[PDB]
Amino acid sequence: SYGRKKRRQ
Amino acid sequence: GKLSLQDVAELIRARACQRVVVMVGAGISTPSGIPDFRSPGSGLYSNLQQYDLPYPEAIFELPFFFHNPKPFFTLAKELYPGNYKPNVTHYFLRLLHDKGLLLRLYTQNIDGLERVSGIPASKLVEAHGTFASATCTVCQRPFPGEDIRADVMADRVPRCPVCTGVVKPDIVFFGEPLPQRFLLHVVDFPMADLLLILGTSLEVEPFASLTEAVRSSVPRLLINRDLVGPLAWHPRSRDVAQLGDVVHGVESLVELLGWTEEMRDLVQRETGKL
Ligand SMILES: [Zn+2]
C-alpha cells in the first residue's frame, strides 16, 4: 500500500 | 554535532520527544528462540527440507504456495500463537506505550509477539499481516485464526467449509499489497518526533522506505547488528547508530532512560501470565 511487498534484492 | 545514544535518551527524559514511531523486524524476535527458517540447524529448518522449496523465500510466494502449501503451513504451525513469548525488546516497546510515548509501532514480523506483549491493536501496524485471521483463496470468506488452528496443528492444509479452497492466513506474500492499516504511515510519520528502528535489515519494500518519511529534523535511532538500508546510503545529521546485539542496545537505552527496574518488574509479571 506504498507498493507491493517486494525484496530490495 | 553527531548525537549519541545518551543524547536520544535525554531528549526523551526532557520531554523534547513525545511522539515516537517504531519500526521493527525479525531481529527483535530471535531472542525469543524463534528459529530463522533460512538457517540450517533447527527442527524447523529440517522439517522444511523434506519439501521441494527451491529457496527459502518461496514460502512467502503465491505460485509456490499453490503448488505446495505444506512448507508454509509448517512455518505457520511453528509460529502459531502460544509457542513463543515476547522478550525484553517487545516489553521495552510495551513500557514505551505504557509511558505514553508510542505513536505507532510498525512491524514486519508475523509472530504476533507485539500484541502478546500487551500493546493495543490500535497502536500496532502489522505491515506483513497476521495469523489472527485467514481468508479462503477461492471464495474470499474470512475466518478467525482460531478456526484453522486444529488443522494447522494436525499437519492438515486448512480448507474452506463452503467451497473447499485452501484457506490462507492473512500473511502478506511477496507481490501482495500491504494491509489497509499500513496507510496510517501517511499521518503518523509526519507527526513523529523520534524514529526508532530495531532489529531489521530494511531489505523489504515498501516497509523499508518508511525511514525517509520522518521530517529532516527528527532523530533516527537504529539499534541493530549492522548499519543498514536508507540509513547507510542516505545518512541524515540526527541519525544515531547503536550497533551491536539488539537486546544489549535496548538494555543500554532502558538504563539511560531510567526504566530498568520498572522494565524488569513488567517482564516478570507479564511472562508469568503466559
Ligand atoms: Zn471458500
Residue numbers in the entry:
A (entry chain B): 46 to 54
B (entry chain A): 121 to 394
From the paper:
To analyze why Tat inhibits sirtuins instead of serving as a regular substrate, we solved the crystal structure of a Sirt3/ac-Tat-46–54 complex at 1.65 Å resolution and refined it to Rcryst/Rfree values of 18.1/20.9%. Residues 46–54 of the Tat substrate peptide are inserted in the substrate binding groove in the typical, β-sheet-like fashion observed in a previous Sirt1/ac-p53 peptide complex and other sirtuin/substrate complexes. The acetylated Tat Lys50 interacts with Sirt3 Val292, Phe293/294, and the catalytic His248, and comparable interactions would be formed with Sirt1. In addition, Tat residues in the range of (−3) to (+3) relative to Lys50 interact, similarly, with Sirt3 (and likely Sirt1) in the complexes with acetylated and non-acetylated Tat, respectively. Larger differences are seen for more remote residues, Ser46 at the N-terminus, and Gln54 at the C-terminus and indicate a different chain orientation from there on.
Sirtuins are NAD+-dependent protein lysine deacylases implicated in metabolic regulation and aging-related dysfunctions. Sirt1 features the conserved sirtuin catalytic core of ~270 residues, which comprises a Rossman-fold domain and a smaller Zn2+-binding module.
